[PDB]
Design a protein around this ligand. Structure first.
Ligand SMILES: *[C@@H]1O[C@H](CO)[C@@H](O[C@@H]2O[C@H](CO)[C@@H](O)[C@H](O)[C@H]2NC(C)=O)[C@H](O)[C@H]1NC(C)=O
Ligand code: NAG
Ligand code: NAG
Ligand code: CAC
Ligand code: NO2
Length: 446
């Protein structure tokens, strides 16, 4: 059973705040850094317990995670049991068929030793917390890069930059979460290192931690919206309706959060808002052949690519429990300004916006990296379909800068291909380890 007093809040429940700062640092003076890591940081790291209680929300929620080189800088030479983590994300870029030419320079390397996640309902509170941290740590810490993020405004709160409701689907942890209808149920050790049925040996101090895969993913929103208009399928619906339909068939959900599998032809806002219904599906449908039927949801839709459900076997009635070991916890948050009038008018992005993508898992090779490379980027995943060529994930699928060939999107002809420019541009990121809280003022400060 999980000790949620000792697990960092963002991993299992998220930060629960309007604003986030990702503060990427280097360690200049280990000894001094350690002193303050124990005295200043450890005591104020927010736990799952802490964030799960409405009466004990911190003014500023703080989490902290270390890269491989950061651990080395602290004299921690133990094998964490994750090759990908050890090599760093920059070395992994080829696996995702992307170039580091688009990367934040600070990410394209291993100079970053860690990330502090600060979360508060105002940026003023964040900024003062940064000032305090820099003032106590002094020259022992260097800020190399940072990214500001926020929940989107007004009625778009909870939606990402493309407009879609986000944070509906997460794995439920057996013995911790009470599962929602349709929700996958997994061993804790899928998410938490050293937890139930994590097969990989870890250092004792790392039990209760998780690997944090950070990705700065720019979204080209005006370009996305133009593509939908220009490539909307023919039909008696209005142009906007048919554009919206194409968007939903790429994502696998309407912007309200309603899963297209349960409502294939139109959005259903009441369904989208209902946590008891909006995940209650497997992709199976009575009277339809799972292997060929794309009339409810394309085989290539984002959410179907990243959680295949019945596509990888198991129950045809909810909940489908397939591929539990390939689950990630998502704590991403949008960044950048809202789309401006000039951008919307020209169809051309000038101001960088997108998703500060955060995925937690116990094994990077089974989680984010697997989902991206083996599923999203694989034109024959899921397997055993007709036609066999599913094409790439239209949202995150990558093929070295080339337009992505995506099949199944058009309801009237599942064989019809679309050649789609990237709407999401990786500016890279890093793999971190978020330790259990005990390790922060324990081993890591020792
Ligand atoms: C989740 O979906 C299932 C169907 O996949 C729903 O179960 C069905 O409910 C209807 C209406 O009560 C029954 O007539 C069917 O016999 C049920 N089928 C099965 C396989 O159980 C279930 O109600 C949905 N859950 C929620 C909360 O809406
Ligand atoms: C933006 O795209 C739309 C639809 O393709 C088009 O009608 C409009 O003219 C474009 N705007 C500009 C400035 O080209
Ligand atoms: C469906 O698309 C395929 C592939 O482009 C094409 O060969 C076929 O003729 C199409 N069928 C119809 C009815 O358009
Ligand atoms: C999930 As059904 C009612 O289309 O078999
Ligand atoms: O789909 N990541 O938020």
């Amino acid at each position: 059973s999980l000790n949620t007093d000792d697990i960092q809040g963002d991993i299992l429940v998220g930060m629960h705040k309007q604003k986030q700062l990702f503060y990427f640092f280097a360690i200049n003076d280990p000894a001094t850094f350690k002193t303050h890591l124990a005295s200043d940081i450890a005591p104020v790291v927010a736990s799952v317990t802490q964030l799960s209680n409405v009466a004990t929300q911190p003014l500023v929620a703080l989490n902290i995670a270390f890269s491989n080189t950061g651990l080395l800088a602290l004299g921690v030479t133990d094998n964490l049991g994750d090759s990908l983590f050890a090599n760093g994300q920059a070395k992994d870029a080829t696996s995702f068929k992307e170039s580091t030419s688009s990367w934040v320079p600070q990410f394209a390397g291993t100079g970053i030793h860690g990330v502090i996640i600060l979360a508060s309902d105002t940026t003023d509170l964040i900024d003062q917390q940064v000032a305090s941290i820099e003032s106590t740590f002094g020259s022992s810490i260097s800020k190399l890069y940072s990214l500001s993020a926020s929940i989107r405004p007004g009625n778009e709160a909870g939606h990402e930059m493309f407009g879609f409701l986000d944070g509906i689907a997460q794995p439920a942890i057996n013995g911790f979460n009470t599962p929602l209808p349709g929700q996958n149920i997994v061993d804790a050790g899928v998410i938490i290192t050293g937890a139930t049925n994590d097969p990989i040996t870890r250092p004792s101090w790392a039990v209760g931690g998780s690997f944090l895969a950070f990705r700065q993913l720019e979204q080209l929103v005006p370009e996305f919206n133009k593509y939908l208009l220009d490539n909307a399928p023919a039909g008696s619906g209005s142009l906007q309706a048919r554009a919206d339909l194409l968007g939903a068939r790429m994502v696998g959900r309407w912007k309200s959060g309603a899963p297209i599998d349960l409502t294939p032809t139109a959005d259903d806002p009441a369904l989208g808002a209902d946590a008891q219904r909006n995940n209650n599906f497997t992709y199976s449908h009575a009277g339809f052949d799972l292997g060929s039927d794309q009339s409810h949801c394309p085989f290539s839709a984002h959410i179907r690519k990243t959680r295949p459900r019945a596509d990888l076997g198991g129950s045809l009635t909810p909940p489908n429990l397939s591929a539990g070991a390939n689950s990630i916890m998502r704590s991403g948050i949008p960044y950048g300004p809202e789309v401006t009038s000039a951008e919307s008018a020209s169809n051309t992005t000038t101001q960088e916006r997108g998703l500060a993508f955060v995925a937690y898992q116990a094994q990077l090779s089974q989680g984010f990296h697997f989902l991206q490379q083996t599923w999203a980027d694989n034109a024959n995943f899921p397997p055993g379909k007709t036609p066999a060529t599913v094409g790439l994930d239209p949202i995150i699928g990558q093929n070295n800068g080339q337009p992505r060939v995506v099949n199944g999107l058009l309801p009237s002809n599942s064989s019809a291909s679309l050649s789609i420019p990237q709407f999401v541009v990786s500016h890279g990121g890093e793999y971190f380890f978020s330790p259990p809280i005990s390790a922060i003022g324990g081993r890591l400060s020792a």
